[PDB]
Amino acid sequence: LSASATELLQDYMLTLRTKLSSQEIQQFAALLHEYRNGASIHEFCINLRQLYGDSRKFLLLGLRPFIPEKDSQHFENFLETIGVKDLE
Amino acid sequence: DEQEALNSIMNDLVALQM
């Protein structure tokens, strides 16, 4: 884990602490843990979208480097599809 | 439990790379 990845991780955790409610933190922890234990990237994206909707764009963009290589393309397609990079 | 959830999140984020 590089120094830059370390920085990104710290930044992400801080942003989570600043932005999310206890409930949101619990839900994200749950769905992320499910994905970590072997659940599909598809279900991960569904759960993320159900959690954030069109909001929390920063937190979705920040996940991209963390997505495993084999699931990265699906995640990018997801972000592009739901319009995370589209402000208006 | 919120702190534990945060620790879980960080741990899982690291684990996805390992």
From Swiss-Prot, chain A:
Function: Component of the CCM signaling pathway which is a crucial regulator of heart and vessel formation and integrity. May act through the stabilization of endothelial cell junctions. May function as a scaffold protein for MAP2K3-MAP3K3 signaling. Seems to play a major role in the modulation of MAP3K3-dependent p38 activation induced by hyperosmotic shock.
Subunit composition and interactions: Part of a complex with MAP2K3, MAP3K3 and RAC1. Binds RAC1 directly and independently of its nucleotide-bound state. Interacts with HEG1 and KRIT1; KRIT1 greatly facilitates the interaction with HEG1. Interacts with PDCD10.
Region named Harmonin homology domain: 1-86
Compartments it resides in: Cytoplasm
Lineage top rank: taxon: Eukaryota
Domain notes: The C-terminal region constitutes an independently folded domain that has structural similarity with the USH1C (harmonin) N-terminus, despite very low sequence similarity.
Family membership: Belongs to the CCM2 family.
Record's disease association: Cerebral cavernous malformations 2: A form of cerebral cavernous malformations, a congenital vascular anomaly of the central nervous system that can result in hemorrhagic stroke, seizures, recurrent headaches, and focal neurologic deficits. The lesions are characterized by grossly enlarged blood vessels consisting of a single layer of endothelium and without any intervening neural tissue, ranging in diameter from a few millimeters to several centimeters. CCM2 inheritance is autosomal dominant.
Name used for this protein in its record: Cerebral cavernous malformations 2 protein
Swiss-Prot record, chain B:
Known function: Component of a protein kinase signal transduction cascade. Mediates activation of the NF-kappa-B, AP1 and DDIT3 transcriptional regulators.
The organism of origin for this protein: Homo sapiens (Human)
Protein family per UniProt: Belongs to the protein kinase superfamily. STE Ser/Thr protein kinase family. MAP kinase kinase kinase subfamily.
Assembly mode: Binds both upstream activators and downstream substrates in multimolecular complexes. Part of a complex with MAP2K3, RAC1 and CCM2. Interacts with MAP2K5 and SPAG9.
Protein's name in the database: Mitogen-activated protein kinase kinase kinase 3
Disease entry from the Swiss-Prot or TrEMBL record: Cerebral cavernous malformations 5: A form of cerebral cavernous malformations, a congenital vascular anomaly of the central nervous system that can result in hemorrhagic stroke, seizures, recurrent headaches, and focal neurologic deficits. The lesions are characterized by grossly enlarged blood vessels consisting of a single layer of endothelium and without any intervening neural tissue, ranging in diameter from a few millimeters to several centimeters.
